[PDB]
């Protein structure tokens, strides 16, 4: 299953979320008016980059990875992120958890457009260290407020699936480009923010026995700007 990349993820039936009902796509007529030489429809960059499995406990509150914060500094996406000024990509969010049938829990897989997350009880803006986290990503110190001043009770209006462990352990959110910009710089900006937020703590008769939440992201229809341009003629 999901054989359209250089790396596959074998799982159960797909049940994808068409994020806002739309699929990823490249530049249409917007290519001529945007920054030129965008031609590279980078397919080795579409490798299914599985992030390291964050550890679901009952005492845990949540996790987040911003979509250019993740997948940069590693792989083809990371290398083209350093070599390339600007890019466009949808993201195939795929969230798995090897949780047993006996395990108890709900999990709001929510991908947030522009999660401009605030700090807690400090009026200053969050900076490079507490925004650009990376591969492991940050944890929701206040998942009920979504670290933004918003409410988690209305986080589902965003593109979202639901890991109710009694019925599914798989999420698939097929994110579009999601920017005001047609193409945007991956260094200075994040278009999406995957958020693994348990609205139910992980439940076992033991001390919430171990499940891992393995998160796998493939940049679908990933399109950078072209360094190799014929500057002649």
């Amino acid at each position: 299953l999901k054989l359209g990349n250089s790396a596959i993820v074998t799982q159960e039936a797909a049940n994808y979320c068409c994020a806002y009902g739309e699929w990823p796509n490249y530049l249409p007529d917007h290519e001529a008016v945007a920054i030129d030489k965008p031609t590279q429809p980078e397919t080795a960059t579409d490798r299914f980059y599985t992030l390291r499995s964050v550890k679901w406990e009952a005492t845990s509150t949540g996790w987040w990875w911003k979509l250019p914060d993740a997948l940069n500094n590693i792989g083809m996406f990371g290398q083209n992120v350093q070599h390339h000024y600007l890019y466009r990509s949808g993201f195939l969010i795929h969230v798995q958890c090897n949780a047993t049938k006996f395990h108890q829990g709900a999990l709001l897989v929510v991908a947030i457009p522009e999660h401009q997350r605030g700090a807690h009880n400090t009026t200053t803006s969050p900076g490079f260290d507490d925004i650009m986290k990376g591969e492991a990503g940050g944890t929701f110190n206040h998942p009920y407020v979504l670290d933004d001043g918003t409410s988690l009770a209305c986080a589902t209006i965003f593109p979202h699936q639901w890991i109710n462990l009694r019925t599914n352990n798989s999420a698939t959110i097929v994110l579009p480009w999601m920017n005001a910009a047609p193409m945007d710089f991956p260094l200075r900006h994040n278009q999406w923010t995957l958020a693994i937020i348990p609205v139910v703590p992980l439940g076992t008769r033991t001390m919430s026995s171990m499940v891992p939440i393995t998160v796998s992201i493939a940049p679908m229809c990933c399109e950078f700007n072209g360094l190799r341009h014929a500057i002649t003629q």
Binding site: Y144, A153, T156, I157, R166, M178, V199
Partner: protein
């Protein structure tokens, strides 16, 4: 010259007018409007999608675990598990929801809501659970016996993970019928309750305190009218970022 007279009201500034004024800085083509996904043309498709409620009405449970309710083996049979009122602009589960927050921008919010519960237990966490909805005209149920008399459904979550409830024609508004008193009159127009049809039973290796969440959405007949300022956030008037754009 065209003979015109100034009407009573000419030269006034109405804040709710559709008069197109003079475009300042002209002949400027903006950034050309491209198809950004997720286009919002109406507030209805905002509230037509599901959104969780603050189902735990206990004030001790605040923050995270107020979006969920705990069902254990010691929670017994014929006990009121949640007592969600179907009223928007008063304190309760219908406060930080999508429909409640968008309809807090409006006075009248007549329509129908589509409130959805999923059980969040183990795969074989089986238990019969009766959900009773009561109309605006009637008393709130306290037992399973008076829950059975009203319009109710029996949701056994042994095999079905998410249950889906359709609510007929909730209609509430904001009333200021008192002469300049600003009483902020409210309305009670429904309740959705929960009772335990049997004991929730679990395997010994799984957790006994099995949890439950729920969502609420709206249908196409849900509609809003007469927009107002939402009193969720007041004017703080001493924000730190303020007086910096003013510099």
């Amino acid at each position: 010259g065209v003979p015109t007279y100034l009407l009573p009201g000419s030269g006034q500034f109405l804040t709710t007018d559709d008069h197109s004024s003079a475009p300042v800085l002209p002949c400027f083509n903006p950034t050309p409007e491209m198809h950004i996904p997720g286009q919002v043309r109406n507030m209805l498709e905002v509230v037509q999608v599901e959104s969780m409620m603050e189902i735990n009405n206990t004030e001790s449970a605040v923050g995270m675990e107020r979006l969920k309710v705990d069902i254990s083996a010691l929670t017994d049979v014929d006990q009121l598990l949640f007592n969600i009122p179907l009223d928007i602009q008063l304190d309760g589960p219908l406060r930080n929801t999508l429909v409640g927050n968008i309809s807090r921008y409006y006075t009248h919010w007549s329509g129908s809501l589509e409130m959805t519960f999923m059980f969040c237990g183990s795969f074989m966490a089986t238990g019969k659970l009766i959900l009773c909805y009561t109309p605006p005209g009637g008393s709130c149920p306290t037992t399973r016996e008076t829950a059975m008399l009203g319009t109710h459904i029996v949701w056994d979550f042994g095999l079905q993970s998410s249950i889906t409830l359709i609510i007929p024609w909730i209609s509430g508004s904001h009333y200021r019928m008192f002469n300049n008193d600003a009483k902020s009159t409210n309305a009670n127009v429904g309740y959705v309750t929960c009772f335990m049809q049997t004991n929730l039973i679990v395997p010994s290796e799984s957790s006994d305190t099995c949890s439950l969440i729920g969502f609420i959405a709206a249908k196409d007949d849900f509609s809003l009218r007469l927009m107002r300022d939402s009193p969720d956030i007041g004017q703080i008037d001493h924000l730190h970022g303020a007086e910096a754009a003013y510099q």
